[PDB]
Amino acid sequence: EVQLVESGGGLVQPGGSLKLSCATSGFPFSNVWLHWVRQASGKGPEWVAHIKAKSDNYATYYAESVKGRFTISRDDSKNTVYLQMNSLKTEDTAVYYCTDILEYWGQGTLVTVSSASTKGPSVFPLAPSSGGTAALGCLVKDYFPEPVTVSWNSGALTSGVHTFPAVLQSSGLYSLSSVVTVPSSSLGTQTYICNVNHKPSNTKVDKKVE
Amino acid sequence: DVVMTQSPLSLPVTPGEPASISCRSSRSLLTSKGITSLYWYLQKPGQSPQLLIYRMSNLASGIPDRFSGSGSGTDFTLKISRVEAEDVGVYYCAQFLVYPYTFGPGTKVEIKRTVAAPSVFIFPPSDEQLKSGTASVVCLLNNFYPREAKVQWKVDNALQSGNSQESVTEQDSKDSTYSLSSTLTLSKADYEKHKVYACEVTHQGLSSPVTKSFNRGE
Amino acid sequence: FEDAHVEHSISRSLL
Ligand SMILES: [Zn+2]
Ligand SMILES: [Zn+2]
Ligand SMILES: [Zn+2]
Ligand SMILES: [Zn+2]
């Protein structure tokens, strides 16, 4: 089976450096052309770089916005392609994909370029407290960088759940909320636990909502 | 360069009816060998782009033949004979001929459905957050359509300004509605001076605005 | 000038 697995993303300061890797498997590597494509939230895909094969003398090509700063490279003996990123700018913040540009794309690795420091969220309950439907949830406030994940009752509860996009507050910290609607009559017959995860800070929190 | 453009920006489609979206390149994408270097992708939230049609008119493997592509020189068209639920997302065109390879800005295809007014819920700040010096009030709009909505905060009947933020979900997979969360942010000291905290919602499904509120201290 | 991406794709390598 074909696998393309990016890694190396994370939080880095403006002007700093980062090397992304893309480990691959399941296909003959030697004559496959590969690309890096990036995507900022709310925007479309932007092609970053292209590298051909040994037969092509490993010719490389670059987007206008990254010329002179990024270097795409490949190690055919390890079936891996790389993206070296120097002199990073806030505008480089994005999810970075490796792909053949066609049917096969990795899952992406998130690169955040910013001088702000990592901070884990506090998790506060949105308490239910008259039309047969009640609502409850969790507010995940003041974290950086993205992203945060929320589940309910360890994934058993999905119907009625709404997990909203984070908002960037004027403080430069993110905040998001996750809710679920429930029949009001059963408040007390079910336990409701939101499972909040913020890997950049190693925060994993479960919060009972009453 | 070659610049790729698309229209419309958004396209609501009733399930079972056709959809047609357009793309344009700033120069011809025909190669000396008769191939047209134009590619179509569908992207769903949280997923990577999915190839649908390659080289203008060839269906990618496993893609239902409800999809088809055509083109004349610099103007291209993607068609869906009958829209199904898994078709929703952002459609992008792209050229891989002139080496600053470029993608279009995308066309968002959504499911059209009947108007649905939201149901509204309001959450006071938790005491847990209050003992930290800040207060967040949250207003929830559940399962409405269409997406346009106006949420206003009123504290002791005074319309608030500049101190709230909103976010909206993508269309629900089962009933094609949206939900929306709004957060009013206050200092603990300001929060405790006031009695009535209200969320006022305007929506096309509502003949008049709906207000949900609570009194601090229940 | 030319487009050879299908011919250098992961899909092609599998044949
Ligand atoms: Zn070759
Ligand atoms: Zn709902
Ligand atoms: Zn289908
Ligand atoms: Zn007052």
Count of pairs with CB atoms under 8 A, one residue in A, one in B: 112
**Contact residues of C toward A, CB < 8 A:** 4-6, 8-11, 13-14
**Cβ contact, residue pair A169, B138, below 8 Å:** no
**Cβ contact, residue pair A31, C13, below 8 Å:** yes
Distance B186 CA to ligand 4 centre (A): 13
**Cβ contact, residue pair C5, A103, below 8 Å:** no
Per-residue burial over B86-95, b if 16 or more Cβ lie within 10 Å, else e, is ebbbbbbbbb
How far is the C-alpha of A24 from the C-alpha of A163, rounded, in Å? 32
Nearest residue to B165 (alpha-carbon basis) of A173, A128, A113: A173
Q: What type of residue sits at position A82? A: Y
Q: What type of residue sits at position B139? A: C
Nearest residue to B163 (alpha-carbon basis) of B133, B187, B192, B194: B187
- Smallest CA–CA separation between A50 and chain B, in Å? 9
DSSP A153-208: GGGTB-TTEEEPPPEE-TTS-EEEEEEEEEEGGGBTTB--EEEEEEGGGTEEEEEE
A183 cis-preceded (ω within 30 degrees of 0) = no
What is the CATH topology of the domain spanning B4-111?
A: Immunoglobulin-like (2.60.40)
Nearest residue to B39 (alpha-carbon basis) of B12, B6, B8, B15: B6
What is the CATH topology of the domain spanning B119-215?
A: Immunoglobulin-like (2.60.40)
Distance B82 CA to ligand 3 centre (A): 9
Residues of chain A found within 8 Å of residue B166, distances taken between Cβ atoms = 167
Q: What type of residue sits at position A152? A: W
Nearest residue to A122 (alpha-carbon basis) of B125, B191, B14: B125
**Residue range(s) occupied by CATH 2.60.40.10 in chain B:** 4-111, 119-215
How far is the C-alpha of B93 from the C-alpha of B95, rounded, in Å? 7
The edge-to-edge listing of strands for the beta sheet with A3-7 is A3-7, A18-25, A80-85, A70-75
- Smallest CA–CA separation between B60 and chain C, in Å? 11
Neighbour subunits, C (≥3 Cβ pairs < 8 A): A, B
How far is the C-alpha of A93 from the C-alpha of A90, rounded, in Å? 6
CB A194 within 8 A of CB A179: no
> Which residue from A52, A53, A102 is facing C6, i.e. has the nearest CB?
A102
How far is the C-alpha of A98 from the C-alpha of A51, rounded, in Å? 11
Could you tell me which residues come within 8 angstroms of residue A189 by beta carbon, excluding any fewer than 6 positions away? none
Residues of chain B found within 8 Å of residue C11, distances taken between Cβ atoms = 61
Count of pairs with CB atoms under 8 A, one residue in A, one in C: 38
* Residue linked to tokens 């005491």: B127
The domains found in chain A, sorted by start residue, are: 3-113 (2.60.40.10), 122-208 (2.60.40.10)
What tokens appear for A55 in the block? 């037969």
Distance B46 CA to ligand 1 centre (A): 33
Ligand approaching nearest to the C-alpha of A32: 1
What is the 3-class SS of chain B, one letter each residue?
CCCEEEECCEEEECCCCCEEEEEEECCCCECCCCCECEEEEEECCCCCCEEEEECCCEECCCCCCCEEEEEECCEEEEEECCCCHHHCEEEEEEECCCCCCEECCCEEEEECCCCECCEEEEECCCHHHHCCCEEEEEEEEEEEECCCCEEEEEECCEECCCCEEEEECCCCCCCCCEEEEEEEEEEHHHHCCCCEEEEEEECCCCCCCEEEEEECCC
* Residue linked to tokens 């039309």: A131
Distance A125 CA to ligand 4 centre (A): 25
How far is the C-alpha of A51 from the C-alpha of B107, rounded, in Å? 29
CB B41 within 8 A of CB C7: no
> Which residue from B92, B126, B138 is facing A45, i.e. has the nearest CB?
B92
